[PDB]
Each structure stands twice: as structure tokens, then as C-alpha cells.
Amino acid sequence: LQMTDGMHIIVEALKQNNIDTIYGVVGIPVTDMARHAQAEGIRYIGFRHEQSAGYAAAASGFLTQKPGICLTVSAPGFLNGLTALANATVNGFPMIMISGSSDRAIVDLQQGDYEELDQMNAAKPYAKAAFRVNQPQDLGIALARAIRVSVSGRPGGVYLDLPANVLAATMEKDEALTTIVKVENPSPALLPCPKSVTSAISLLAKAERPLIILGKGAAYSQADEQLREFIESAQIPFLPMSMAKGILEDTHPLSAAAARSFALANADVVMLVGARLNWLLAHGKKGWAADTQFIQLDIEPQEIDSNRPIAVPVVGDIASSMQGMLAELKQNTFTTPLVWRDILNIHKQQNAQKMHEKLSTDTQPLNYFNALSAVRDVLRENQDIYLVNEGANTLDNARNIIDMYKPRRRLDCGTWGVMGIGMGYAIGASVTSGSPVVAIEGDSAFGFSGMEIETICRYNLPVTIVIFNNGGIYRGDGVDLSGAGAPSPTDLLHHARYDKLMDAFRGVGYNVTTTDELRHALTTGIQSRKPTIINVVIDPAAGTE
Amino acid sequence: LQMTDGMHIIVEALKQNNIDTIYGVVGIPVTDMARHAQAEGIRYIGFRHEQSAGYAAAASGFLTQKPGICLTVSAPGFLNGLTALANATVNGFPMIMISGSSDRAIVDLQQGDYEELDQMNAAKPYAKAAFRVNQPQDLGIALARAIRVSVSGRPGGVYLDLPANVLAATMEKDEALTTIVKVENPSPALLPCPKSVTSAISLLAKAERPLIILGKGAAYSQADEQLREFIESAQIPFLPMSMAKGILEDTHPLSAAAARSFALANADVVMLVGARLNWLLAHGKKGWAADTQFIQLDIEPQEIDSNRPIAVPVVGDIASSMQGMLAELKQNTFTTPLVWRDILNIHKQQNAQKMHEKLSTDTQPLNYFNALSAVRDVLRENQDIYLVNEGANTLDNARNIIDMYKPRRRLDCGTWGVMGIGMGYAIGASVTSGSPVVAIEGDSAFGFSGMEIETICRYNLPVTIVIFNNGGIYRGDGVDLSGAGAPSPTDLLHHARYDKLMDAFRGVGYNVTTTDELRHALTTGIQSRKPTIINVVIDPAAGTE
Amino acid sequence: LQMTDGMHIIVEALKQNNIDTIYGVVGIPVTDMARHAQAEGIRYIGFRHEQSAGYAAAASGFLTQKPGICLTVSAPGFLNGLTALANATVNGFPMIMISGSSDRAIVDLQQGDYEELDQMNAAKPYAKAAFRVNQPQDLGIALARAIRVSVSGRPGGVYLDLPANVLAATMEKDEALTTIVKVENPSPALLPCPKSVTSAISLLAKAERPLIILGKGAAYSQADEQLREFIESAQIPFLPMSMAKGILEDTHPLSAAAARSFALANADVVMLVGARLNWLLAHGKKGWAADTQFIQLDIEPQEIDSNRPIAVPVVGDIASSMQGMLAELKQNTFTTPLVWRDILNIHKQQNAQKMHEKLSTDTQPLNYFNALSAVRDVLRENQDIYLVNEGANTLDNARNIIDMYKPRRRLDCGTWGVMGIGMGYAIGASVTSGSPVVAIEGDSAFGFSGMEIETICRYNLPVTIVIFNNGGIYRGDGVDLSGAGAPSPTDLLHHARYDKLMDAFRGVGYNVTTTDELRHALTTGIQSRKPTIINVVIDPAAGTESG
Ligand SMILES: Cc1ncc(C[n+]2csc(CCOP(=O)(O)OP(=O)(O)O)c2C)c(N)n1
Ligand SMILES: Cc1ncc(C[n+]2csc(CCOP(=O)(O)OP(=O)(O)O)c2C)c(N)n1
Ligand SMILES: Cc1ncc(C[n+]2csc(CCOP(=O)(O)OP(=O)(O)O)c2C)c(N)n1
Ligand SMILES: [Mg+2]
Ligand SMILES: [Mg+2]
Ligand SMILES: [Mg+2]
Secondary structure, eight states: OEEEEEEHHHHHHHTTTOEEEEOOOOOOOOOOOHHHHHHHOOOEEEOOOOHHHHHHHHEEHHHHHHHOOEEEEHHHHHHHHHHHHHHHHTOOOEEEEEEOOOOOHHHHSSOOOOOOOHHHHGGGSSSEEEEEOGGGGGGGHHHHHHHHHHSSSSOEEEEEEEEHHHOOOOEHHHHHHHTTOOSSSSSSOOOHHHHHHHHHHHHHTTTTSSSEOOOOOHHHHTOOHHHHHHHHHHTTEEEOGGGGGTSSSSTOOBBBBGHHHHHHHOEEEEEEEHHHHHHGGGGGGTOOOOTEEEEESEEEEEEESSOOOOSSSSOOOOHHHHHHHHHHHHHOOOOHHHHHHHHHHHHHHHHHHHHHHHHHHOSSSOOOOHHHHHHHHHHHTTTTTTEEEESHHHHHHHHHOOOOOOOSSSSSSTTTTTTTTTHHHHHHHHHHHHHEEEEEEEEEHHHHTGGGGGHHHHHTTTTEEEEESSSSOOOOOOOOTTTSSOOOBOOOTTTOGGGGGGGGGEEHHHHHHOOHHHHHHHHHHHHHHHHHEEEBBBBBTTTOO | OOOOEHHHHHHHHHTTTTEEEEEOOTTTTTTHHHHHHHHTOOOOOSSSSSSHHHHHHHHHHHHSSSOOOEEEEEHHHHHHHHHHHHEEEEEHEEEEEEEEEEEEHHHTTTOOOOOOHHHHHHHGSSSEEEEEESGGGGGHHHHHHHHHHHHSOOOOEEEEEEHHHHHHHHHEEEEHHHHHHSSSSOOOOOOHHHHHHHHHHHHHHSSSSSSEEHHHHHHHOOOOOHHHHHHHTOOEEEEGGGGTTSSSOOOOOOBOOGGHHHHHHSSSSEEEOOOSSSSGGGGTTTTTTOEEEEEEEEEEEGGGTTTSSEEEEEEEEEHHHHHHHHHHHHTTTOOOOOOHHHHHHHHHHHHHHEEEEEEEEHOOBOOHHHHHHHHHHHHHHHOOEEEEESSSHHHHHHHSSOOSSSSSSEETTTTTTOOOOOHHHHHHHHHHHHHOOOEEHHHHHTTTGGGGGGHHTTOOEEEEEEEESBBBBSSOOOOOTTTTTTOOOOBOOOOOOOGGGGGGGGEEEEEEHHHHHHHHHHHHHHTTTTTTEEEEEEEEOOOOO | OHHHHHHHHHHHHHHTTTEEEEEEEEOOOHHHHHHHHHHHHHHHEESSSHHHHHHHHHHHHHHEEEEEEEEEEEHHHHHHHHHHHHHHHHTOOEEEEEEEEOOOOHHHHHHTTTTOHHHHHHHHSSSSEEEEEEGGGGGGHHHHHHHHHHHHHOOOOEEEEEEEEHHEEEEEHHHHHHHHOOSSSSSSEEEOHHHHHHHHHHHHOOOEEEEEEEEEHHHHHHHHHHHHHHHHHTTEEEEEEEGGTTTTTTTTTTTTTHHHHHHHHOOEEEEEEEEOGGGGGGGGGSOOOTTTTEEEEEEEEGTTTTSSSSSSSEEOHHHHHHHHHHHHHHHSOOOOOHHHHHHHHHHHHHHHHHHHHHHHOOOBBBBBHHHHHHHHHTTTTTOOOOOOSSSSHHHHHHHHHHHOOOOOOOOEEETTTTTTTTTHHHHHHHHHHOOOOOEEEHHHHHHHHHHGGHHHTTTTOOEEEEEOOOOOOSSSSSOOTSSSSSOOOOOOOTTOOGGGGGGGGEEEEEEEHHHHHHHHHHHHHHHHHEEEEEEEEEETTTTTTOO
């Protein structure tokens, strides 16, 4: 009798389901598991804080449609991981957080166990599902569920709880192998009702001023060719939400991004593609026509009529829907009014002109617009990068200024406006892709995951971090209104040199005060493939609050 | 009619309740509140991550018996703060986390608000209470409750939710002033049943081998003189739990710490003073006599019989209890058997001898024992510091080796074994005391709150950070068992120089490889009162897992 | 080697802790547990629905200060009992609900087990603590905690989860006996700050118009003699809340009940004794002087400053605080001003006279006032009874009109205004005391637990149920506003005869349309000690609608 244990079973389950990376922080009881997973050919990436590890996991699920794996220990590590699990769920990114937990009997009586918490029920409100495995023969089915749940419907976080004892529990090795489940097709296609598809084309054909909105669901769907084809056939102006930038290149002629306010105020029929009417679209109220009619393509029927009533729900998975939308268009082709495209273009150009003047006008110190014009100069010549971006002014201005050329290349604060996602998204993106990453970081944003620069160095990841050091949150020029001369609630240290942090870890730092310095430092950064911080001196007074 | 708003009301409530510091991270909707609080003479301390701010708040409540105040924004900031609120509750440290929340009507319908979450119900499982204020006329009563709840019973975290709209809501300034509540005596004395006090002395008088255990509740109580007096009158050997070190100096003759295992294995009557029989005392099972009888002084009746049956519960607040224990002793004095004190001392000395040999034996590279012998050399000559300590080996060895001379001077990982508490406890301790802090940090532990070094610099706090750089979690010598040469799950960067991090922020760094270097670097550190990192090179193989 | 199992251990643990009654409803996996508990001398009371079993447990807790035991099966049984656990925690009544649950491994993975629900987490929001026991050797200590938690602080419900596997799990009998825990003094006395006590007496001694308020915390504490001596010594007028009626008799010359709103509107110093400034006291807001100063005796510091700022908190158990208050009074005596007592008495008199016209005036049909005057005349002669009461007009009028003479004899809708406590309360009160119970029930109220009349007949309990049948919720005279002639939302069947329900179970029914018939039926009911229903024909227009 050859015998095995839960730890070995779970690692084998992960292997057969083609998990090739784990993002984590170890400690009791999970160290041996991570060692063995690595032993078994799984890439283990160890972080300085579990939050970043969970952010890396979610980033990777967003890029692949395969759930990223976050590994943590019991209560204090689990809780740090839980904050990233929550954010994955909110954003619709698939991931599974696997955490050690303590002794079920002790925790159930609340006697004060090591790292005691009911982790399973603690995760429930933040996860699509929360599963706990008490028997090693159930590990494989439990992972099967975790995988399916994480990628079906609107994708999200799943919590898988592994009590210390299930990892130690033994079974016959042969029988164990029969309990392992390899999931085929974890999220099947769900096709819309044909009649809703035909109503959708019909209402679009009757539209005087149609607009398509592409959200993260559109991006996640990988239906890039189908979307382009639909948009181009009917010449329908579209707006990309932040992380849908690049499905079609941002400089595409049908992009209404440069006159977004005007487009939303005037469109008479709006077609949401995996985009919620949440605060990011002002709930379809402020800045919109009183009378807009909506078509909505969403995988999740519970999202329909969440905010404004939806004339044409088109419920099913987005690729499937666009397949059928395409076929129905071919049977009943139309072209969007030229006058609409034309009035759009009029606004687009006035706005690009005003932008251009801000972008080409040099200043000392640098502001957000000339600084980002410099970044854009370099990124135009380096189109195969991933862009991670977080902050306030640093976020809004980079979103508007940096164009994306390819789909699923932008990672940012997201639906909850989280400061802290940059390092982890940077690591998840580069581990997943093997490509360089540029992280354009506000200086407050940066400090929420800063220590992860050590991890970037430890794994020799090609990430260049560009910090917009304006000396604080929004602006660097706050004053202590007491007359006591203390830093104001929004000030960070006057003239901090973030590029130096890298000295500690044998990585590259540049300090940049001008666009020419910035251009050089950022080009070298990317082309070197070395971990790098670029500290960018930004006028403390360039930001708005 | 002079009019005021919720923001102004809440700041005034905080002022009248003698809140003089707020630890926080701002953003929407709380920036204006922090600015005004600072305007009104409240010291605002702004962090890089809310977790550290909440740790600072809890540290300050532990030292003062006054709840520390943690201020955050809505969902993503609230969630980061929640992880420190949870830890305060677990440890029995008073604090109030005040967070902005969004629009109640939008969140209640789950329509996708800005930073949407039911923060109130999210905090419930981690807090003594969670309150939400919808009317500005209720702000003062709500803060009154927050304060009382946080400090009564076993102290803990309280969540106070302030929707964006209550901060904007206006009322007549004069009437507003009548709605503000100044709490007098937030936690009244609770005196034990006289009969339980007399049973307690009685069972102690009959004891052959009595032992007292002092927990964090004993420490928090500030009953230092009463405890010393009781222990010395009856000559009762005591053990200090980690953060009760220093109530009586650690070198006190009645301290059984150097033969802790023996003391617990043999004591026949154990008197718990604000110490739980949780995992930290192995639940009163493994390493204890089959037949130990317990006396327990605890403020919380729900803690009695949690683990082992308790012969003599003494329920009431600890100062009150020790008052009555003292009076009853005087009426019925006894002395602990000399033979017990003597056998204890026999073990104590054998153990101090073995320790001494590890401590005085020089090595290259340094190990935990000679390194800490060096720290202890410096701390003997600098007794007015606060000691923050976290890690694994760094934690266990510093606990055993560094003596405390005064009460409530040690801050560490605590009941949940949290890596990440060091910077925040360091900042909370120095802001609260005005004294220097020495943080003895494992290198994994450090990276959970590292970025807070900027904050230490921004406020020019006298904190010296001593990092035990063994190159990883527990040990620095892990190997990738795949044969791929990747860092093992436990390795951090080979030879990272954490002292350099300080360059970024205009603070002091030392690298130390020997005890003489360490001694010099640490003395200068403290006496300079400058923010400092000491990177200490530790044999990667000195630790145990 | 003699073996035992979890089921045997928990029963022994109950026995050693002096549990002598369990209220429940059996089924998988607890039927054998109940059988064996009964075999071991524990009295088993089985119900038609678990919520009444849970209501009976919490009544038994309030009466005795020993947690009542409610037993249920898994998910659907559990959830019914949980509604009653909720009510106990809200009212401050100690009880423990012990529920069987299913297989931990299956429920943890949400595979659709038999009766699947994480019952422990389900109970958490409604209970002082929720515990779950996985190992048989942990059963005794789990019960010890449940007991201590249920009775310490402000008492409340505790949930104790017994997975089917733990009940069947075996261990050696001798080793098993060593893991049983007998709790001595589960709620220790907690003594107030003596400074609080001296400040309280001094504020009372400065008051021009002091008022004591007795809450159900005062009734639960069992400090009847200390509260009475304190009140009578300084001659402080007192208001009893509903379930505090009778600590001192309601006819006591110092009761301000007959002038409640005057008393609250005009007192300058008010001493709350286990009484919360919650909605039953209008939060200390509406109907109170603008600057009332409060002294508050409560065991729970969390309750202080909940609503109004409290001038003098006196935190500790009510018996110990009253012991300190009396000793401080004896050192520093004072007598409430005669003028305040005399002016209260003038208002009590105006109100008492208004109430007397209503009570004494005959009507056909009967109304609440003359019907209850007849009930009061009967109850004055039977001061050993327990009074259960619920409904709306039926509750408020009985509460004002039926005087209590002894403490802890009145049981009602309580803090959450629950309809459906009536039969549970009647059963727990009679089983607990051995005494007759009279339940004065609104007809809508009764229907929430009416099938428990079979339980009452099964155990031959001395319960007389008097239903004020006005044909509806508040009133029986509603009309369908659409014109279709359907019953209105507040109507119940016109002229239902609830007295006839008892023929199913060999109980006694009376139907009564007059005060003389009511008086006779109710007297015969009480004396008979037989399960009885009295259907009282009340005017459908007599009631007012709350809101
Ligand atoms: C975890 C978290 N904490 C706090 C906030 C509130 N918040 C919004 S923006 C921001 C930082 C803004 O400054 P910065 O990143 O430096 O960019 P800048 O505006 O200065 O370019 C913060 C802390 C948040 N969104 N997330
Ligand atoms: C937030 C959190 N994450 C993970 C753990 C698990 N854990 C225990 S010790 C430890 C770090 C141990 O190494 P280190 O701090 O460097 O001290 P050393 O043993 O090397 O001296 C970790 C991550 C924890 N307790 N808390
Ligand atoms: C469990 C529950 N359901 C509903 C209510 C709402 N409610 C208040 S009083 C009442 C019944 C009133 O009628 P009745 O009991 O017949 O008294 P009457 O006023 O007619 O004498 C109800 C159902 C409640 N309080 N509890
Ligand atoms: Mg900034
Ligand atoms: Mg280390
Ligand atoms: Mg009725």
C-alpha cells in the first residue's frame, strides 16, 4: 500500500487542471504545499503581502479566462488575501484563493485556536462561493467546483478553505488518483434568445444616433474580432471603458472617446456590451439623454434593470451574443447615420486640438499632460507592453492620454477605485505574459503596495515603474490650517526619491525632471527588461482634488 | 441663523472627548474632515496604507485606555482598515475606525455606487459594535456609544460609519452644540463578588505550588503597583505573557519565565490575571499538570470555562479585583512554599546558564542569540524606549532575550500572530509617548508594512528599525526542489540592503555584520532620535521553521 | 472496556447541570436523545412547532434564571426554533437551543446534504453565542460555556449545534465522565462602583420629583425585597414596565402607573432599574421633560448612553446594585417630597375615575373594558396564577387593567411585539411553576400558536385561554374597498367559535357574550385545572387600529 496525503492530492488536482503558477505568501500550515507544488513544476511567486498576491491572481484570470491561484495561511494572512478576493469579485475577474485554516473542532467552539476565525463564512460575502474541504477524498471535486464557479456567469473570486488537518490526512495513493477531477470546458457557451437578438438589430437599425459601449466584460470575453467586425460593418461609434481600451485600437476612426460627454448626452440608442450602468456611467442619469433606449449584452440576467430600464436585454455570454448579433446584421444590414458620425467627429477634433496644446506645452516643473505626452512618445514605439495604472490625476490623465493598440493590455483601479493594485497587477501581467509592464503610479497609490518592488527584483521581472511624484494625495501643496506647520493630511514627504528604493534590491532607478530625461529613462527601462523605478517630479500644484 | 454641518459636529464631538490624534488615510469623502480636525488642534497622522493606521490606533488604545482613532474612506480603504479593526478586537485593544461611506439609497439597492459596500454590516463580525449615523443630530450620541463600547468589558474595535451625506448635512449651529456628548468615566469599575475573592485567597493559601500568569489584560489594566504588591507579599512566582513583560521587571526574583515549561507542568494552582487559556497557553492541556486548579480574574464572564473548567472565577475589572484580592490577603496572609520557589530557581539558573553560552558565543555570520545579546547590551543602557517586535525566530528569540523594565512597553504580533503590525505599532507608540521606539523586525515581517518608513520620516519620529535579514521566511537557505534554480517559497532576495530604503526618504541607514557594528549602530539610532534602519546580516541557517 | 456515545454524554451533562425539562420537537437525528433524556428523568415537553418550544424555554429562563432548553432537528426545525431564540436574546431571557445538524463535510461543500445549512453561522446574529461540537469529549465543556453565556451579562439565547456524527461518536465511559462539567454559580455577582452609588443617592436626595422605573431586568433579577424596601423607605413613586408589574403590587399606593404620562412628563430625576430607554419609553424623548436627569442601573455597560445621556450610570447586576443603594440610603436618608406624591395622586385619581366609568359600564356586545373588568374581578381572587397576554387592544387594555400581585407572573409580546408567544409562554409557565395560567389572547394573536392547545391537553396543563374575539386584527368591521365583498385584510372569520377547537382534544370550551357568563366560565376554568378555551364575543368596532 502506497499512501498519499491531502497536500499531495491538492497539488495533483491543480496540475491536472493546468495550473502553472501560484501567487502567495506561506507560513503555517501552507509552506510544505508550496514547496511541493514548485517541486511538481508549478511556478511559485511569493509576495511581501497577500493583497498583492491576490491582485496578481485576479489580473491573471482577467487575461486568461483561467482563474489565478492565490495561496495564503490562516486568519491574519487569509484576511489580507480576502481584501483582493473581494476586489476580483467586484470586477468580474476569476480567481481562487486557497487558504490554510486551523482546527475545525477548536474554532467551532471559539476556544482561542492558533489564527482562529471561521474563514469560510468570513469570505462568503466577498466571493462567488466559499468551500471548505474536511476529507482528502473530496479535494478534487472541491477544486472542480472552485474552478467552475470562478469562471461561470460573471467571473469572480472563489474561496477554498483547507484545514491543516486535511492537508495531513492520508489515503491510499491509487484510490486518491481516482478522486481527482479534471474539468473540461469550465464555462460553457450560453446563447441568447434569438428574438432578443433580432429586436436588438432592429432597434439599432431605427436609431438616429447609436452608440456602443465596451466594458471589461467585452474585453474579458476575447471576442475582439467579432466586436470589430460588428462595429465596422454598421459603422457604429463606440466608447471603450477603461480596461476595454485596445479591443479596437484607441485611434480607430469610430472611437467616440474624444467626445464622450457629447456622445452620451445625445445617443438615442446605447448598446452596452459587458458594461454595467454603475457609477462609471453615472447610472445612465446625469450627462445622458432623458430618453435613451438601451440594448444590453450581459451574461448575468440579475444585472438587467439594475439602474435604468433596458429596452432590449440580450442575455448570454458575450462571444456567443456577438456571433448571433453578427449573423442577424448580415440578414438585415444597416449603416449608422453619417450625420451622427459627422457631428461626433466635429467634437472629437475640437477636443483633440485642446488636448494637443496641453500635451506639447513644456513646463517647469512638469505637469500631468507634458509628462504623459513623453510617456506616450515612448509607448508609441513599444506597443507590446502591458500598462498598469493607478492614482487619481495619474489615473484620469493616463487613461485619456495613453492609447492602447491591443486588447486586454490595461490594468487599473477598476470598479472599486482601489489604490494598491499596481505591483500585483504588474507581477500578474508579466508572469502571465512574459512581456514588459509599465506601471504609471501616483505616489500615494504606489505606497499601498511599494514593498513588492523586492518581489519584482527577486524574480527579475521586466517591470518599469513610473511614479508621478507630486508630493501627495491629489496635490503636494497642502497647508496645516492650524498654523503648526505639520504636513497636511494630503502631503507626502517633500521631494521623496522613490528611485532610490531600488538600491536596496539591486535594481535600476532614475530621477527625471524633464520630458527628455523621462523619454530616455522610460525607453531604457522597457528595452533593458530590468526592474526599474522612474521617479518623475511633478508640479505639486498640477493636480486637482 | 449660524449653520453647521455633520463634519463640524463630529470634529467637535472628538474634541470634547479629548481625542488629540487621528491616524488615517484620506480621499473621498473624508479629506475635508481631516483638514478641519487638524485645523482644530487634532494631530493628524497620515499613512501609506490604512492597515498601519488601524494598528497605530489600537497600539495607542492599548497604552492609554483611550480608544485610538482610525479614519478611512469608503469600500477599498474601509476594507484595509477592517483587517486592523479585527486584530484590535481579537487582542482586546480599544479603537474606533471612522470611515466615510457612500449613498445609502444607492448601496441599499446594490446599483453599483462609488465604492459600494454595506460597510456597517461588513464590520460587524470584527467589531464590538458597528454604528451608522444618518442624521447629523445623532453624531454626538453615536460617538458616545462608540467610546463606551470600545473601552468596556474586554476592550476592542468599534466601527463608526459616516455616509457622505451626513458629513454634508447641515443644522443650526447652536442646536448642534446641544447634541454633543462628552462621556465621563467611559468604563466604570466592576467589582467582583466578595465570596469569589475569598475563595481565591483560600485556594492560593492551600496551594503547594502556586503560579500567577499575567496576560495583556493585566498589562492593559495599569494595576502595576497592586500586582507587584500582591506577588511580593505572598512571594508567588509569576509568568508574564509577552506584552505583560515589564509590569514587574523581567529580572524580578519571582519571575518563573526562565523555567516556564517546568512551572506550568508542575504548578498545582494557577491564577490567570487577564490571560486567556487560548493557544498561547496550550489551552491548559499539553505541558500542564492533569489536575491544575485555576483561579481566573477576567472582566468578561463569557471567557470562563472556555477551555478548562475554572475552580475560582473572579469576574470584574482587574484593578478592582486586585484591590479586593489585596485586602483579603491582608486579612488572611500566607507565603508560598519556599521549596517551590527553590525548585523553580534551580531550573531558572540551569536555563539562564545555557542561554548565556548561546548569547556570549560570537559567530560569523551572526545568529539570533549573539545579535540579540548585542541589542540587549544597548537596551540595558536605554530603558525608556518602546519595543515593537515581529517575525518568527526574530519574535521568539527577542521575546526571551530582551528584558522589559517598565509596563506596557512591548508591542508584538499578538493573539493572531500578525506579520504587519511593526510600523503602525512603532508610529502609534511614538506619537502616543513622545519616546524612542526600537522595532526588531524579521525581514518577511517588515515587508508587510515597509512603506510606512516614509511616514516615520514625514513626521520625524524617533524610531529605529532593526531588521534581522536572514534572507527569508524562517530561513534564507531554501532550494527550488524542481532543479530549476528559482527562489524557494521562503526565500527573499539574497543580501537585500534594507538600510538603503531610507535613502529615498532622507533617513539614516546602517548595515551591520558584527555585534560591535550592531551595538554602535543601535546606540546612535536611539540617541539621535532620527528615523533609522539597521540592516542586520543573519546567518540564513540560524533559524528554525 | 465499557463504551458510551455523544448522545449519552450530553444527556448526562444536562443532568449534572440540573436541567429537568426540555421543550422540543424531535425527528432525525435527535429523537433518541429525547427518549434517553426522558429515560434519565428529564421531563420532555413536545410541541406542534419549534418556535413555541423556544418560547416556552425562554419563559422558563426568565422565571428561574436557569436557561430553558429547546431541542430541534436540523435545517427546517432549526430555523423555526431560531425565530424564538432571536426573541429571547432581544428580551434578555436565558435559553439554550440545542439542534442536531447534518454531515459537516457535505454541508461545508454545499453538495445538497439532507437538511443542509451552516446552522451555527445562521444563529450567530440572533444569539449571545453560537457553538458547534465536533468531538464527544468536548460536549461537557460546550454545555458549560452555553450555560454561562446564556445567563451572564444581559441574559439571552445561546445556540448549541450537535452534528449527527457527534451524537453517535463513542468514547470510553470512564474517560467520558471526566469530561462532564458542572457549572457552579454560572452568573457571578458584579458590584457597582461605590462612587456611582453615592452619586445616585445624592441625586435622588436633591430631586424634587424623583421617579423609579422598574424594567423586566428588575423583575428578572429577583431582588423583590430590596427594591420594595428601597422604594418604601424613601417613598419614591415607581412605574413598572409590563413584565415588572407585580414586583410590588400594582395597587401599591406609590405606583404611578395610573398617571404614567404625567409622571414621565414631570419627573426631574428618573432612576431606571433594568429598563432600557428604547421605544417602550419613547427613547426618553417624546413625552418627557426636556431636562430629565437619569440614573441607570443596568448590567450591560454597552446600554449606557444608548439614547439620552445618562447622568449617573450604576453598572453591575441589579441585586448587587440595589444592595449598595440601600446601604448608601441608610447612611444618607431622605424622603421624597410629599407635594410630588400628592400631586401624582391627584392625576392618578382623575385617570382612575375615567377608567372606572369604562370598566363598570355594561354594553352588548362586550367591549375591552367591561370584559376585562370581569376578568380582573376573577383574578383578584386567584393571585397564584400566571398571566399570559398578547394581541393589540387585547394586550394594551389587559396590561392597564389586570393588576399583578406577585412578581414574574406576567408574560407578554415583549420588546419585539411578537404575536405567537401565548401558548409557548403558557406551557413554559405552567410546566415550570406547577401553577394555573390564564392566557388573555387577541384572536389574531392566538392563531399564531393555537395548535399548541393539543400540547396543553396532552400534558393536562392548567391553562385557561380567554380569547377576545373581535373578528380581526385590531377590529372586525373592515370592508373590502374595491366593492367586491371579500374579507378586508384585517378580518378573520365572522363569529368563529374557538371554544370548539377543544373538542378535538377532549378539552373544555365556553362561549361567552356577557360579563356574568365570562366571570363564571373563567372561575370554573381556573378552579377546574382543566385545559379550557373561553371564546369572548367582543364588539368588532370596540378596538382601535395601531399606527
Ligand atoms: C485603498 C484605498 N485607500 C484610499 C483611497 C482614496 N484615494 C483616492 S485617490 C487616492 C490617492 C491619490 O493620490 P495619488 O495616487 O498620488 O495620485 P495623484 O492625484 O497625486 O496623481 C486615495 C488614497 C482609495 N481609493 N483606495
Ligand atoms: C499577515 C500574515 N501573513 C503570513 C503569516 C505567516 N507567517 C508566520 S511568520 C512569517 C514571517 C517569518 O519570517 P520573518 O519575519 O522574516 O522572521 P524570521 O523567522 O526569518 O526571523 C509569516 C509570513 C502571518 N503570520 N501573518
Ligand atoms: C409574528 C407577528 N406577525 C405580525 C405582527 C403584527 N401585529 C400587531 S398586533 C397584531 C394582532 C392584532 O389583533 P388581535 O391579536 O386580534 O388583537 P385585538 O387588537 O384585535 O384585540 C399583529 C398581527 C406581529 N406583531 N407579530
Ligand atoms: Mg500623488
Ligand atoms: Mg526572515
Ligand atoms: Mg382581534
